[PDB]
Amino acid sequence: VPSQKTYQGSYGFRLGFLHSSVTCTYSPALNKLFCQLAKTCPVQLWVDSTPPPGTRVRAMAIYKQEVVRRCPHHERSDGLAPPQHLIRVEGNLRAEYLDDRNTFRHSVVVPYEPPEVGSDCTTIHYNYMCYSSCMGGMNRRPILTIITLEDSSGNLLGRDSFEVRVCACPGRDRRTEEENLRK
Ligand SMILES: [Zn+2]
Numbered sequence: 001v002p003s004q005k006t007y008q009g010s011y012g013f014r015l016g017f018l019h020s021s022v023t024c025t026y027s028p029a030l031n032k033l034f035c036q037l038a039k040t041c042p043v044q045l046w047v048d049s050t051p052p053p054g055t056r057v058r059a060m061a062i063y064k065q066e067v068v069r070r071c072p073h074h075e076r077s078d079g080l081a082p083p084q085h086l087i088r089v090e091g092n093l094r095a096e097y098l099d100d101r102n103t104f105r106h107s108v109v110v111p112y113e114p115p116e117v118g119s120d121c122t123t124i125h126y127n128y129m130c131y132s133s134c135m136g137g138m139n140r141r142p143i144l145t146i147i148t149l150e151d152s153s154g155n156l157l158g159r160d161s162f163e164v165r166v167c168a169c170p171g172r173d174r175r176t177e178e179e180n181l182r183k
Contacts, residue, residue, distance in 0.1 A: 002060060002103075002105065006161070011048060011050070011051045013149045014160050016043075016121055020040055020041065023040065025174050026162075027174050027177070027178055031163060033165075034167060034174040035167075036168065037168075043123070045112070045122040045147075046122075047149075052151070055152075056109050056110070056111060057112050060148075061144070061164070063142070068086055068106070069085070070083065070137055074129055087107075089124060128164060131167060132167055133167070147159070
């Protein structure tokens with residue numbers, strides 16, 4: 001099972017989020033992102049110092065409590081992300097879709113890019129292609145997205161993660177879960 005241990009590492013790597021009708025909303029209290037199917041999910045990459053050129057950013061989904069993949073229905077597109085992949089990157093011409101030869105787990109990698117002239121963090125846009133409730137897919141089991149900062153050889157430089165619930169009413173479900181957390 002892929003490690004989900006938070007690791008800021010030498011560059012002080014950690015994630016930040018943005019609220020995007022609600023299509024995407026993040027709960028700091030639950031460290032959980034609630035999002036609609038296939039909509040833009042802005043995830044920010046924050047570092048204290050800039051990693052070396054050739055640095056890469058990998059996103060992978062795992063069950064919080066077995067490979068995470070789309071249910072048969074949602075496998076059926078940009079012609080880049082394999083139909084079985086739950087996580088897709090939006091607006092990046094250099095996304096690589098990978099399947100581990102040993103664990104069969106899917107992941108999508110993009111080159112790490114320093115913040116834009118004026119901005120303090122790097123934003124990557126992700127899309128989740130199947131619902132948390134999908135039978136034959138996640139079937140209501142909670143999942144986690146693990147983001148790893150890596151060197152050109154795949155060595156770990158940093159790691160952060162967040163739970164994700166892909167659902168039809170992100171704002172409503174976030175409120176329900178936070179209220180219940182409070183309860
Ligand atoms: Zn599905």
